[PDB]
């Protein structure tokens, strides 16, 4: 049996891209007759452990290791030496800036934001101005879903008055949200970048009282995720991990196998 360990940015599961993602795996696992563990640090930036985690992963001797990686620079300080220890790289959700995985399974974030950023241009169409909570600043993902953001907002991309980072930590979302609409009384689109940010924006939206005033639109989870939201970008973090399982499988029969591979999103708009 062939030994896969994968590595999430966090095992959250009130997380509910997390939590998929596991069953994706878990699935593609029972499905191919694959030995697979977890291992994930407690929070989603702790890349410091999660490099502690992945030399472990190494010393463990598996066929494959699946990383989502805590920091698009960083994490290849311990990711540099899964190859050379044999084993198979899988990146699924969040790359490196370093070109060492094997396979690549994500979504196009870069698109993701763009959509998003294309709502918001057209709620902004007359007036308003945008605060944004984001998660890791370092991160991948949250890179590309804001570089995204910008494109889709074109000339409109100056609108953007804020940019706060909770961290993927639902009290930060919600102190970054509450001190934004504070700060900018003319914010009348909220924009969450993961399904953290949104949901602490849109709970402190709500205690602000301002749901008819100020409208929130994100990237989030899964089909899975609720309204006074007005648009949500929704991945496929099943088949994310499903995919990352299945094709690590090609890799060890040394068969072809792209070296990405886009795990598809939707818009879903309130009209």
Same mark, same amino acid.
């Given at each position: 049996?062939?030994?896969?360990?994968?590595?999430?940015?966090?095992?959250?599961?009130?997380?509910?891209?997390?939590?998929?993602?596991?069953?994706?795996?878990?699935? !593609?696992?029972?499905?191919?007759?694959?030995?697979?563990?977890?291992? $994930?640090?407690?929070?989603?930036?702790?890349?410091?452990?999660?490099?502690?985690?992945?030399?472990? $992963?190494?010393?463990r001797?598996?066929?494959?290791?699946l990383? $989502? =990686?805590?920091?698009?620079?960083?994490?290849?300080? =311990? !990711?540099?030496?899964?190859?050379?220890?044999?084993?198979?790289?899988?990146?699924?959700?969040?790359?490196?800036?370093? +070109?060492?995985?094997?396979?690549?399974?994500?979504?196009?974030?870069?698109q993701?934001?763009?959509?998003?950023?294309?709502?918001?241009?057209?709620?902004?169409?007359?007036?308003?101005? &945008?605060?944004?909570?984001?998660?890791?600043k370092?991160?991948?993902?949250?890179?590309?879903?804001?570089?995204?953001?910008?494109?889709?907002?074109?000339?409109?991309?100056?609108? &953007?008055?804020?940019?706060?980072? #909770?961290?993927?930590?639902? +009290?930060?979302?919600?102190?970054?949200t509450?001190?934004?609409?504070?700060?900018?009384?003319?914010?009348?689109?909220?924009?969450?970048?993961?399904?953290?940010? !949104?949901?602490?924006?849109?709970?402190?939206?709500?205690?602000?009282?301002?749901? =008819?005033?100020?409208?929130?639109? #994100?990237?989030?989870?899964?089909?899975?995720?609720?309204?006074?939201?007005? $648009?949500?970008?929704?991945?496929?973090?099943?088949?994310?991990?499903?995919?990352?399982?299945?094709?690590?499988?090609?890799?060890?029969?040394?068969?072809?196998?792209?070296?990405?591979?886009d795990?598809?999103?939707?818009?879903?708009?309130? +009209?």
């Amino acid at each position: 049996q062939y030994y896969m360990i994968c590595i999430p940015k966090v095992l959250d599961d009130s997380s509910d891209f997390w939590s998929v993602l596991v069953e994706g795996a878990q699935m !593609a696992a029972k499905e191919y007759e694959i030995k697979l563990e977890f291992m $994930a640090p407690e929070k989603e930036e702790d890349y410091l452990v999660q490099n502690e985690l992945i030399e472990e $992963a190494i010393k463990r001797k598996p066929d494959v290791i699946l990383l $989502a =990686a805590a920091d698009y620079e960083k994490t290849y300080d =311990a !990711a540099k030496e899964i190859k050379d220890a044999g084993i198979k790289l899988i990146v699924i959700d969040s790359g490196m800036k370093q +070109d060492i995985a094997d396979i690549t399974v994500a979504t196009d974030n870069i698109q993701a934001g763009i959509r998003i950023g294309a709502v918001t241009k057209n709620l902004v169409r007359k007036s308003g101005k &945008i605060g944004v909570i984001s998660f890791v600043k370092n991160s991948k993902t949250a890179m590309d879903r804001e570089e995204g953001l910008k494109i889709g907002l074109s000339d409109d991309s100056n609108k &953007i008055e804020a940019i706060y980072y #909770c961290d993927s930590n639902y +009290d930060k979302a919600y102190d970054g949200t509450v001190e934004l609409l504070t700060k900018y009384p003319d914010i009348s689109v909220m924009v969450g970048l993961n399904q953290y940010s !949104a949901t602490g924006a849109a709970r402190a939206i709500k205690d602000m009282s301002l749901e =008819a005033k100020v409208k929130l639109v #994100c990237i989030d989870s899964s089909m899975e995720q609720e309204g006074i939201f007005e $648009a949500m970008v929704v991945q496929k973090p099943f088949n994310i991990g499903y995919l990352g399982v299945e094709k690590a499988l090609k890799l060890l029969k040394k068969e072809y196998v792209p070296k990405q591979l886009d795990s598809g999103c939707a818009l879903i708009t309130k +009209d």
